[PDB]
């Protein structure tokens, strides 16, 4: 049982239309939904449709704006967005319910700002620690998501900052730490993905 | 003596008042099942808004020997009517404190500017249960009424599935005012077993389901090691 | 539009019970709840039909209440709880939910353990960045920044948090700068200790 979805930046006043896969059958008789967590603390069902009948539920304040609707042979469903705004930002669940499962969701932002891939300096790492902390520092792109990653088995003790909005009307840094065996660094190699879903834009930094 | 012990007394509505979303309700035990109920008969108030409620008596029965009982939402309110407008519905029949309410089961539907498009509605049993829905027909007083509501001259009300069908029509004028209400709310209900779709079809006058309700039943309604078998009980 | 909201947000240590609250505006109850929410991940449903253990769910969660007024329970804290917990579904009604409530937990480490980088080879182009990393500590701090001093405080918005499912841990910082002046740039961490400093640059 599990659920895909697919979207990006906007600008307001744009449309955009969003889209869940579905595996573990009953695509036809059960029905599914789509939610949001907005930003500030995480919040809202915005829609929902049934099995046979096909019907659509949404709330007021969306209502004539947003659409959903569901086909039972693709196995997929989408939710359309139009009229988009500053609320509107917010990320998105596709989610199915049961009578008698959480999708992945993804991320919907609502500006004309220019999606920009970001660019990564890598913070090489002083006495001898016997571990050696790394950071990856990430700087100036937008919008989100990123995911950073020291690929696989490194990224035990990983972590990566909650980015903040560079403070030029916006356009964000993220930075991340690897702290490792200092018997590893200069000897085995060690690199950082930076990835950012929409541009494109898949990026290798080895330390150094 | 006793004949009695019986579950679910109603403490504020009647079996009609309540089971219809009447305000004065909302007491007792959130969901259940019983033997039968009771009521504090409520007549000289009963169901706000005036009117008959048909196979009453069929019902009370019908309501008896339920096992399962689960209120659920056939249609929302807010999805389910488009085209049409949905809280006009309030009346002084059923005032919530202070502000004039409506029943909590219903929905009293009416033309959103100046528009009665026709409406069309169904709903279609997944249970193994027997789902029943109740809705209500309204016949406004004066032609003025009539349209100031529903938009709507000749305007028929039918009806879906199969153990029950059936057809309405509007009868515009004036009753004595009770409630200052020279209209009627006529009030109904049907069975869906568990494979039959309920439709509703309407031009007007319909009042209709939000809440539902579904149930079920049964007929009768309102030396050491044998031992070790006890002897019996529920 | 039904509202059903919980209460504070509150913390715990490991040993012993949570207990979180929900208020419907009115009575209620076909679904997907919620219950939990990592920092930044997808919610999951501990009790639906607020008696009932989603199947799977570890024990220590609990529901309970009666119509219109509600509770959540984990009785031993583990790390993970932690998270957001919003309850969820007015079950029949436009759906609603609230923000939820905070929930950390005990560890009591004064221990950020610094790291100090200095700007970059590719950063020339544009320029230039230091940034601290000050992690796996408890709770939550002050990094001051040093190149020289004082005449005003010192600008350049940087830091970040998270919490956390196994400590709180990490914050990360960074410093923006153009180019500029004196090669002695420390970031030195705040917090309840005698303070332990790392230093700018000589290699």
């Known amino acids: 049982v599990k659920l895909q979805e697919s979207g990006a930046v906007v600008q307001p006043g744009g449309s955009l239309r969003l889209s869940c896969a579905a595996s573990?059958?009953?695509?036809?008789?059960?029905?599914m939904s789509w939610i949001r967590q907005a930003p500030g603390k995480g919040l809202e069902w915005v829609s929902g449709?049934?099995?046979?009948?096909?019907?659509?539920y949404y709330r007021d304040s969306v209502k004539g704006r947003s659409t959903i609707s569901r086909d039972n042979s693709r196995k997929t469903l989408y939710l359309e967005m139009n009229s988009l705004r500053a609320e509107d930002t917010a990320v998105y669940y596709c989610?199915?319910?049961?009578?008698?499962?959480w999708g992945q969701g993804t991320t919907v932002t609502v500006s004309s700002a220019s999606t920009k891939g970001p660019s990564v300096f890598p913070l090489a790492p002083s006495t001898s620690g016997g571990t050696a902390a790394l950071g990856c520092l990430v700087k100036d792109y937008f919008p989100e998501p990123v995911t950073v990653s020291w690929n696989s088995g490194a990224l035990t003790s990983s972590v990566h900052t909650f980015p903040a909005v560079l403070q030029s009307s916006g356009l964000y840094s993220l930075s991340s730490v690897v702290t490792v065996p200092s018997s590893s660094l200069g000897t085995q190699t060690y690199i950082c993905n930076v990835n950012h879903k929409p541009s494109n834009t898949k990026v290798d930094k080895k330390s150094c | 003596k006793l004949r009695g012990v019986a579950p679910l007394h109603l403490g504020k509505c009647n079996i009609a008042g309540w089971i219809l979303g009447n305000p004065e309700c909302e007491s007792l035990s959130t969901a259940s099942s019983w033997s039968y109920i009771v009521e504090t008969s409520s007549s000289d108030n009963g169901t706000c808004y005036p009117g008959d409620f048909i196979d009453y008596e069929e019902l009370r029965e019908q309501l008896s020997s339920v096992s399962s009982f689960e209120r659920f939402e056939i249609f929302p309110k807010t999805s389910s009517w488009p085209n049409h407008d949905s809280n006009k519905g309030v009346t002084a029949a059923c005032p919530h404190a202070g502000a004039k309410s409506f029943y909590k089961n219903l929905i009293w539907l009416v033309k959103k500017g100046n528009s009665y498009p026709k409406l069309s509605k169904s709903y279609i049993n997944d249970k193994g249960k027997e789902v029943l829905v109740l809705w209500g027909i309204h016949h406004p007083s004066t032609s003025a009424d009539q349209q100031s509501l529903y938009q709507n001259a000749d305007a028929y009300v039918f009806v879906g599935s199969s153990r029950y069908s059936k057809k309405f029509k509007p009868e515009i004028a004036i009753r004595p005012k009770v409630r200052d209400q020279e209209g009627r709310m006529n009030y109904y209900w049907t069975l869906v077993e568990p494979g039959d779709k309920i439709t509703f079809e309407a031009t007007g006058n319909l009042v209709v389901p939000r809440y539902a309700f579904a149930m079920e039943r049964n007929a009768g309604s309102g030396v050491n090691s044998v031992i070790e078998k006890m002897n019996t009980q529920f | 539009i039904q509202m059903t909201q919980s209460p504070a947000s509150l913390a715990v240590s490991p040993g012993q019970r949570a207990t979180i609250t929900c208020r419907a505006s009115e009575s209620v109850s076909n679904f997907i709840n919620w219950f939990q929410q990592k920092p930044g991940q997808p919610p999951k449903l501990l009790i639906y039909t607020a008696s009932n253990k989603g199947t799977g769910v570890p024990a220590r969660f609990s529901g309970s209440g009666s119509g219109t007024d509600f509770t959540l329970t984990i009785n031993p804290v583990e790390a993970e709880d932690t998270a957001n917990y919003f309850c969820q579904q007015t079950k029949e009604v436009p759906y609603g939910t609230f923000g939820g409530t905070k929930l950390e937990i005990k560890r009591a480490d004064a221990a950020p353990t610094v790291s100090i980088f200095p700007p970059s080879s590719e950063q020339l182009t544009s320029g230039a960045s230091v940034v601290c990393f000050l992690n796996n500590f408890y709770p939550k701090i002050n990094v001051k920044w040093k190149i020289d001093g004082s005449e005003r405080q010192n600008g350049v918005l940087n830091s970040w948090t998270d919490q956390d499912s196994k400590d709180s841990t990490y914050s990360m910082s960074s410093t923006l700068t153009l180019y500029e002046r004196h090669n002695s740039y420390t970031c030195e961490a705040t917090h309840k200790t005698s303070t332990s400093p790392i230093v700018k640059s000589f290699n």
């Open positions: 989610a199915r319910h049961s009578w008698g499962g």
């Open positions: 449709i049934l099995g046979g009948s096909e019907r659509s």
């Open positions: 573990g059958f009953t695509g036809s008789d059960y029905d």
